[PDB]
Design a protein around this ligand. Sequence first.
Ligand SMILES: C[C@]12CC[C@H](O[C@H]3O[C@H](CO)[C@@H](O)[C@H](O)[C@H]3O)C[C@H]1CC[C@@H]1[C@@H]2CC[C@]2(C)[C@@H](C3=CC(=O)OC3)CC[C@]12O
Ligand SMILES: O=c1ccn([C@@H]2O[C@H](COP(=O)(O)OP(=O)(O)O)[C@@H](O)[C@H]2O)c(=O)[nH]1
Length: 435
Amino acid sequence: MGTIEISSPSKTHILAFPFPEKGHINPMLHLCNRLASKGFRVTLITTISTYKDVKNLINLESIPDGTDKGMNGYFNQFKNSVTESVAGIIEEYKLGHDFPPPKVLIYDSTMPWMLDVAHGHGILGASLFTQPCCVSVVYYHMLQGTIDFSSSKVLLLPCLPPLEDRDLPEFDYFKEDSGFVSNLLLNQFLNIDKIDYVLFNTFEMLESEIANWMSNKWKILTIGPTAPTAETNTEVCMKWLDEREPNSVIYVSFGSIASLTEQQMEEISQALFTTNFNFLWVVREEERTKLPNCLPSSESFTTAAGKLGLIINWCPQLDVLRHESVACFMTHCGWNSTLEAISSGVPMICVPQWVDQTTNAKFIQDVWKIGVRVNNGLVKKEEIERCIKEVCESEKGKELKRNAMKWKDLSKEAVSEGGSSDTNLEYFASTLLFY
Ligand SMILES: C[C@]12CC[C@H](O[C@H]3O[C@H](CO)[C@@H](O)[C@H](O)[C@H]3O)C[C@H]1CC[C@@H]1[C@@H]2CC[C@]2(C)[C@@H](C3=CC(=O)OC3)CC[C@]12O
Ligand SMILES: O=c1ccn([C@@H]2O[C@H](COP(=O)(O)OP(=O)(O)O)[C@@H](O)[C@H]2O)c(=O)[nH]1
């Protein structure tokens, strides 16, 4: 005689709150699906403006965007507003009757003060880093002042390859804002010893040495890629790709924020309109006016080489990357783009722009050996064409593609049963249930 209590995922309530930007929303969202696939109740909290895009099982809550229409004023208003409204949501659910009360807030690692919201409301806090281990450690070392950041400089950090100046995360691009952006990334570590779960969207084999190094300081859980293994304009892009030859398309995307200069846009244009390959070039709506005048939701071309090109304002990038028609990825090397390509086996042309893109480029070409970085800071048509020849028209290109298929298989192994990422995510979920 007596009573039994069962803690299952279905009675455990996970809150998620990403920073409102696609390279932060996207990997959170994938992780919420995986967690829901594991039976938990998952509520994704998101700003009202991102709510729409996102809105197109997983619970969805909206909060006020909390930001009048510079980087700094926007951020302090944001910090202030979302601190209040997320704290309010947590309390809403603690009294609710439908859902279970929340056990843990997963928050983007660029909002470390959300650990205080979570703890200060008596729930666990899980920090999701949306960048690899190797660049995150650089931010930590800059935070610590572990080293000094007519001569060139090379930095030697434990468990990392030598880093040239150009290999460091690029903050100076932001000029008077470099201090804010740099602060934002280093402050990911202000309370690292206090975070209940430290999650990294990466997989162990990709960053063995530095991941183990961070594991001996912090019980970090590498859990990526969060995206599934084998979006606006899906049907359009797949139709066009379905009708191209295999291994014939150069996929070109510079992410969701970066915006190249008129001159740089022209360098790329001339390289792609004269190359021996088809091309699918994402050019965001707001960026379209920076195109060469010689060229609206999409545009179809016959290139001067007699090939075919499609300019479009947004695509399902993951599905493009996994289409047999894609030869290579010309990318700005944001970490989501880099990891999606890794998990798809697509070799890469690296045109890094700022923050962690420069360091990702370093690793893509020199550590993982799955792509080439362009040399500058304007990048000339001729330099783009050299890199296309390297990656798509050369025996080197062929080894690069082999390298990428090896990393893709390792990536699929990591998130499959008994994979290192599958283990870590199961460690997250199982301990969530513990008394
Ligand atoms: C600092 C900021 C936040 C990070 C954003 O993107 C990153 O996402 C990935 C991490 O998961 C990386 O892999 C990507 O390489 C990286 O691009 C972009 C950077 C830089 C731009 C600024 C955001 C934070 C918001 C920001 C301040 C917004 C803003 C502009 C302004 O004048 O007031 C507000 C818009 C972008 C922004 O400048
Ligand atoms: O046409 C596009 C271009 C980009 N993306 C997605 O937007 C994210 C971009 O994140 P990333 O870290 O690569 O760079 P950021 O945009 O933050 O600078 C990735 O998940 C891409 O797959 C997309 O869905 N469609």
